[PDB]
PDB file of C-alpha atoms in Angstrom:
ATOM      1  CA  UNK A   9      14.286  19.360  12.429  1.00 11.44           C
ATOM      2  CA  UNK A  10      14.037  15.527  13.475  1.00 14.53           C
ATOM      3  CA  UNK A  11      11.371  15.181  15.839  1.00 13.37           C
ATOM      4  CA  UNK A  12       8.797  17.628  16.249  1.00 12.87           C
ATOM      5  CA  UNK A  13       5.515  17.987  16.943  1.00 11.30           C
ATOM      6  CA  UNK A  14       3.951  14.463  17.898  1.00 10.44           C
ATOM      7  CA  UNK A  15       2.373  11.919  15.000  1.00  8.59           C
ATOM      8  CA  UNK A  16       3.134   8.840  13.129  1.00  9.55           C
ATOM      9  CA  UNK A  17       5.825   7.570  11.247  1.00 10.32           C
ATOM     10  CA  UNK A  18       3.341   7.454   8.011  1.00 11.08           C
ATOM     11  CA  UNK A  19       0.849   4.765   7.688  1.00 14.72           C
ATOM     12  CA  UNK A  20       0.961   1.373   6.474  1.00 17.39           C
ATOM     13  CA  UNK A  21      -1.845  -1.176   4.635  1.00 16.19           C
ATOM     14  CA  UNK A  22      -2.454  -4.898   4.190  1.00 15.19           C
ATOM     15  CA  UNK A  23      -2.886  -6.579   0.988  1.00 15.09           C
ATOM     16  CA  UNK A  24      -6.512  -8.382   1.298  1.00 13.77           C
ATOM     17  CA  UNK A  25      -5.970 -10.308  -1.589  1.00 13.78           C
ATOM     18  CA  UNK A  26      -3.271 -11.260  -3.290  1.00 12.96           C
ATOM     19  CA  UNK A  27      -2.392  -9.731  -7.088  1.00 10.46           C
ATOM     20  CA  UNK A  28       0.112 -10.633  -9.708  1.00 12.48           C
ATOM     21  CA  UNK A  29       0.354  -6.902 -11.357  1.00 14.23           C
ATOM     22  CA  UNK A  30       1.173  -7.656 -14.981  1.00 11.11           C
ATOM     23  CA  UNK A  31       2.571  -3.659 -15.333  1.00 11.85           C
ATOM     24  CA  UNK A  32       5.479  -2.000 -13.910  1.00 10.58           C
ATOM     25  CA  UNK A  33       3.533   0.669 -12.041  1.00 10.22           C
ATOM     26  CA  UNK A  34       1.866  -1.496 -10.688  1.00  9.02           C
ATOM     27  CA  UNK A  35       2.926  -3.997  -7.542  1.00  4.93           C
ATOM     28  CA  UNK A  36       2.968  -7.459  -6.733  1.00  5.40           C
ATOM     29  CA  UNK A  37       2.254  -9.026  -3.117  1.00  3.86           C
ATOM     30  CA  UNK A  38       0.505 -12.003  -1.413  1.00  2.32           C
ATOM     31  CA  UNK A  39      -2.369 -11.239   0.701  1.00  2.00           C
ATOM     32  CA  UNK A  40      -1.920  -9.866   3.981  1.00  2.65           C
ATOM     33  CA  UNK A  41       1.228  -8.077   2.492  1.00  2.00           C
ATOM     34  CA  UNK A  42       2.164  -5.053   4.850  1.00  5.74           C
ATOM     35  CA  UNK A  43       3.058  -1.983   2.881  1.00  5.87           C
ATOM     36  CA  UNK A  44       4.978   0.597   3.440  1.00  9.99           C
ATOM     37  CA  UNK A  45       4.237   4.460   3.447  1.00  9.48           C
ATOM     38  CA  UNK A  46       0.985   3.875   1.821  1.00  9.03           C
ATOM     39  CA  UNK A  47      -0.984   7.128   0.262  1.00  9.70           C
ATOM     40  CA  UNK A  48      -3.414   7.621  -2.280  1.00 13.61           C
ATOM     41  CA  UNK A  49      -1.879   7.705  -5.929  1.00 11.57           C
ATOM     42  CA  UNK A  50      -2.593   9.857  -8.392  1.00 11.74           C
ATOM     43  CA  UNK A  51      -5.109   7.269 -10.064  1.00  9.39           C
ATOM     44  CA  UNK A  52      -8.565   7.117  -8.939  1.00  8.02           C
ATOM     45  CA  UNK A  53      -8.968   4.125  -6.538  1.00  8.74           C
ATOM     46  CA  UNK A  54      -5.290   3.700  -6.666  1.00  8.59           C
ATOM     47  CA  UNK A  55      -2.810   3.604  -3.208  1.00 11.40           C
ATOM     48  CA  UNK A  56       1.040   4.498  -3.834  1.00 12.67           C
ATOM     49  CA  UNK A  57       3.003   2.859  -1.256  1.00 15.17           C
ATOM     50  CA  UNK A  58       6.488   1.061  -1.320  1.00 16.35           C
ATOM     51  CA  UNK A  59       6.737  -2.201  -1.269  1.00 15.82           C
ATOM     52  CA  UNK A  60      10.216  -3.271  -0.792  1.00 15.88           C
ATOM     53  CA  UNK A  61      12.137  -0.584  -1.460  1.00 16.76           C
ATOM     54  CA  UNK A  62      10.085  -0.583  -4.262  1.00 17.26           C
ATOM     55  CA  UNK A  63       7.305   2.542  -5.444  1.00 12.01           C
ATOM     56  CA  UNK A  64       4.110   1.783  -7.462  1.00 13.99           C
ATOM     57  CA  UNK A  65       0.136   1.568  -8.122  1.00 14.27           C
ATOM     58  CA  UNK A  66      -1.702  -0.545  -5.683  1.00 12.13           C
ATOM     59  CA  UNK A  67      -5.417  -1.717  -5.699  1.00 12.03           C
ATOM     60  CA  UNK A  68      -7.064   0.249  -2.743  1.00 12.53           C
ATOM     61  CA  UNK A  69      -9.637  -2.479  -3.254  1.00  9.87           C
ATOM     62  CA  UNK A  70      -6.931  -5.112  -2.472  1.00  8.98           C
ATOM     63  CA  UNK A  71      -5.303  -2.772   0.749  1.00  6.51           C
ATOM     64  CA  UNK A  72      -6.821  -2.571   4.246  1.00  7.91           C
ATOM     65  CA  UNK A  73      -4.716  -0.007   6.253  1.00  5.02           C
ATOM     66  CA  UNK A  74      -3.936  -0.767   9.448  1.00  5.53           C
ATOM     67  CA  UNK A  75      -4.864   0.893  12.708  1.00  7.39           C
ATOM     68  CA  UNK A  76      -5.826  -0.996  15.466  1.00  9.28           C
ATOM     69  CA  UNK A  77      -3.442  -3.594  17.264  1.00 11.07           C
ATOM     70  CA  UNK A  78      -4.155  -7.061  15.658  1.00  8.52           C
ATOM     71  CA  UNK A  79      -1.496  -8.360  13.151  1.00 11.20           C
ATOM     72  CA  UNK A  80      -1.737 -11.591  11.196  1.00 12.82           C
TER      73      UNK A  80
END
């Protein structure tokens, strides 16, 4: 059933700094790259979002999720 019992449309992060992954699993972005439906991976240290209609391994030590109203 679409649209239940209330909460959030998953959660999103912000690339701090930007990476150039070198692997496939991996992702590229620029800093302060919004993710999308970001989650821990299976790696240790590791988020698993979609970037772009695009799935792989993220740097939680590159990611600051975002909560509070601020943008930018």
């Amino acid at each position: 059933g679409s649209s239940g019992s209330s909460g959030t449309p998953f959660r999103k992060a912000k690339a701090l700094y930007a990476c150039k992954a070198e692997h496939d699993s991996e992702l590229s972005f620029t800093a302060g790259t919004v993710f999308d439906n970001v989650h821990p991976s299976q790696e240790p240290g590791w988020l698993e979002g979609t970037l772009n209609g695009k799935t792989g391994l993220i740097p939680e030590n590159y990611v600051e999720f975002l909560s509070g109203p601020s943008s930018g």
